[PDB]
From Swiss-Prot, chain C:
This is Spike protein S2'. It comes from the Viruses. Acts as a viral fusion peptide which is unmasked following S2 cleavage occurring upon virus endocytosis. Residues 1-35 form a coiled coil. Glycans are attached at residue 174. It comes from Middle East respiratory syndrome-related coronavirus (isolate United Kingdom/H123990006/2012) (MERS-CoV). The chain holds residues 1033 to 1224 of 1353 of the full protein.
UniProtKB/Swiss-Prot annotation, chain D:
The chain holds residues 1183 to 1224 of 1353 of the full protein. It comes from Middle East respiratory syndrome-related coronavirus (isolate United Kingdom/H123990006/2012). Glycans are attached at residue 31. Acts as a viral fusion peptide which is unmasked following S2 cleavage occurring upon virus endocytosis. This is Spike protein S2'.
Length: 184, 330, 185, 42
């Protein structure tokens, strides 16, 4: 069925490895690491030292390795290689789709469109409003199929009520029906 | 009487395959023997998440006014409603949000904030998303749209709860509405006429007194914080359970593979799988319980807007305590 | 039901989903472990099933009480509660059965083509200022003054059948010419 | 002697046709013979 669905994230993959292959030469990259028997995947960053230096490995409150004192004298922060969220925007009738990378700036991904909910590929910005949104993206955004073409990025309209002014007087304005219908 | 009604829960999806196996093929191979586990996790949450978008859509469709007067500075006349006038959210509404501690989910670029700045503190459940394998999804409506709904609601109050039928709108002063509301509960017109300034002053004291009310003694206010804390707890289960070994030699699949051969390696990976499958089932069961509760609550909110806000209620205790006169919503 | 139908094919780490295969291939010290994996998986499945039947039956029961209220409020009565029944002003509701419950058919009154007119809060005899009227379930509108019902603009004369006598107020108009019959005293 | 007050606030005012309704007689109603309010002065 048509809808917006979460699917497996787009995985970051190692671009190399560090072993204590030096850390300083691969900062900012996702690498596999093996540091004095401690291993996993992550991204090293140069940062301010925390924790006790003599203990080498700095852990967080969930027992993840979050920092490391290297034998080259530097302290590095360790971040997980982070996956890139993926949501599929799909329209069954048109057999078309768009991909939303929620929370992701497009610098990591028509070209990609940056929206209030993440980076989206497959949508074209339309500066169009809808009330009748079937594929809400979040915030007040909606994917609108072209019908097939590309899905449009539409904004959901606020439907304003009839404005009835108050009077500076002893009288008042009455907004009153002149017609009617029945509905179910 | 202040009251908080929860209408939604935070919507979360889980990359179950990543959560359980962390990209390790041996684990994925063993995970397959548990059937379409992850399909069930994803479908259960997808349905639970649709439920809030439907709940929200229905709730706002009902708060929505047909006809409304514009809010202008001075709205309220002698009745001080500046607290409620849009500054756009109202002043009380911004205060309510500023006083509640809420982590910023980073809907537009959180992925990057957690890399260039890193976690805000210990146990940061927003940055945990990209590590643990879960995602916090954005709400159906942005803030300005929700503000638009309650702003149009404010402007409809005086002219909606006035006479027979729901079809016409009387664009009358707020103050005039209050006096009809007071007359309707047993205060005579001679009294209201002699005391109009006294009444406006008491009304103003009642609302002015509330500006400093978002504190430790405000039960409705704690309920707002608790709804927030419940969302955090739901995410903490996923963030905190991946460090458990569930009897295994390590919480790391990679350590198990590196240390053991298949006949034992299998048993150890399997312990981690069972623990993680259990965790995800518990998570999903709670998202379904919490989304069911929020949906019922949303219907209560719907009834209060229609009974309380768009009308003067004659039901003791339904709205606030004492005799109901007028209600507002932010 | 699909949970029960689909979960028996799982092995839950066992060599087979079939107990008979386990028995046929293994001796007791290992056979036991394999059967036990299937038991744990199936016990888990049944606990999950039951937990959901209890959640679903609790929900349906609450919902049934909502249905009860709607029949009494909606169908057996005209409701004055905005949004309880359908949208717009409730007139009449009907009920038919549905596969797992009731299907409500709420007929409401939906106004359209609204116009703005000028209305009075009430009218007083200018010569006799304590003799005042207010409209009943409608409005006093300029057109001099006439009455219209609240849901449909259709001016008609102000009469004793569409007014009530009220105490005088500062917002009531003082009328001195075409006084309606309730004020011609 | 007798006066009217609104139910939510004590504030006596004269009994008039605007704050009364005619009812069938009951054993608990008072029989008043002097300062009869205007709805009974018939």
């Amino acid at each position: 069925e048509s809808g917006v669905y979460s699917v497996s994230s787009f995985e970051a993959k190692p671009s190399g490895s560090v072993v204590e292959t030096k850390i300083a030469s691969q900062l900012g990259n996702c690498v596999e690491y093996s540091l004095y028997g401690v291993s996993g995947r992550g991204v090293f960053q140069n940062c301010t030292a925390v924790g006790v230096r003599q203990q080498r490995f700095v852990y967080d409150a969930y027992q993840n390795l979050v920092g490391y004192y290297s034998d080259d004298g530097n302290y590095y922060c360790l971040r997980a290689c982070v996956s890139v969220p993926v949501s599929v925007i799909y329209d069954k009738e048109t057999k078309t789709h768009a991909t939303l990378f929620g929370s992701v700036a497009c610098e990591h991904i028509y070209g990609p469109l940056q929206t209030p909910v993440g980076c989206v590929l497959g949508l074209v910005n339309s500066s169009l409003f809808v009330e009748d949104c079937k594929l809400p993206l979040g915030q007040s955004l909606c994917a609108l199929p072209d019908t097939p073409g590309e899905m449009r990025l539409a904004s959901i309209a606020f439907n304003h009520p009839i404005q009835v002014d108050q009077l500076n007087s002893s009288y008042f304005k009455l907004s009153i029906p002149t017609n009617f219908s029945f509905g179910v | 009487t202040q009251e908080y009604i929860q209408t939604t829960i935070q919507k979360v999806t889980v990359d179950c395959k990543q959560y359980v196996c962390n990209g390790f093929q041996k684990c994925e191979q063993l995970l397959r023997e548990y059937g379409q586990f992850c399909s069930k996790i994803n479908q259960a949450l997808h349905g639970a998440n649709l439920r809030q978008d439907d709940s929200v859509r229905n709730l706002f469709a009902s708060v929505k006014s047909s006809q409304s007067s514009p809010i202008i500075p001075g709205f309220g006349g002698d009745f001080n409603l500046t607290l409620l006038e849009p500054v756009a959210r109202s002043a009380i509404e911004d205060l309510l949000f500023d006083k509640v501690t809420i982590a910023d989910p980073g809907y537009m670029q959180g992925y990057d904030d957690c890399m260039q700045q890193g976690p805000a503190s210990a146990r940061d459940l927003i940055c945990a998303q990209y590590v643990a394998g879960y995602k916090v999804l954005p709400p159906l409506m942005d803030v300005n749209m929700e503000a638009a709904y309650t702003s149009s609601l404010l402007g409809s109050i005086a002219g909606v709860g006035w006479t027979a039928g729901l079809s016409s709108f009387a664009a009358i002063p707020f103050a005039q509405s209050i006096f009809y509301r007071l007359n309707g509960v047993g205060i005579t017109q001679q009294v209201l006429s002699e005391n109009q300034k006294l009444i406006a002053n008491k009304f103003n004291q009642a609302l002015g007194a509330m500006q400093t009310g978002f504190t430790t003694t405000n039960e409705a206010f704690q309920k707002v914080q608790d709804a927030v804390n419940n969302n955090a707890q739901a995410l903490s289960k996923l963030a905190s359970e991946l460090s458990n070994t569930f009897g295994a030699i390590s919480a790391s699949i990679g350590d198990i593979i590196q240390r053991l051969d298949p006949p034992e390696q299998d048993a150890q990976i399997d312990r981690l799988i069972n623990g993680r499958l259990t965790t995800l089932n518990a998570f999903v069961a709670q998202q379904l319980v919490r989304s069911e509760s929020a949906a019922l609550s949303a219907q209560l909110a719907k009834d209060k807007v229609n009974e309380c806000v768009k009308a003067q209620s004659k039901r003791s205790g339904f709205c606030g305590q004492g005799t109901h006169i007028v209600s507002f919503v932010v | 039901l699909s949970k029960l139908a689909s979960e028996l094919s799982n092995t839950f780490g066992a060599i087979s989903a079939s107990i008979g295969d386990i028995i046929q291939r293994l001796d007791p010290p290992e056979q036991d472990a394999q059967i036990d994996r299937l038991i744990n998986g199936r016990l888990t499945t049944l606990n999950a099933f039951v937990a959901q039947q209890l959640v679903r039956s609790e929900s349906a029961a609450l919902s049934a009480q909502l249905a009860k209220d709607k029949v009494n409020e909606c169908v057996k009565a005209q409701s004055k509660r905005s949004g309880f029944c359908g949208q717009g002003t409730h007139i009449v509701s009907f009920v038919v059965n549905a596969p797992n419950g009731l299907y409500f058919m709420h007929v409401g009154y939906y106004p359209s083509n609204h116009i703005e007119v000028v209305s009075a809060y009430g009218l007083c005899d200018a010569a006799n200022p304590t003799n005042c009227i207010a409209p009943v379930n409608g409005y006093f509108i300029k057109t001099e003054w006439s009455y219209t019902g609240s849901s449909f603009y259709a001016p008609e004369p102000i009469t004793s059948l569409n007014t009530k006598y009220v105490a005088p107020q500062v917002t009531y108009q003082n009328i001195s010419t075409n006084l309606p019959p309730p004020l011609l005293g």
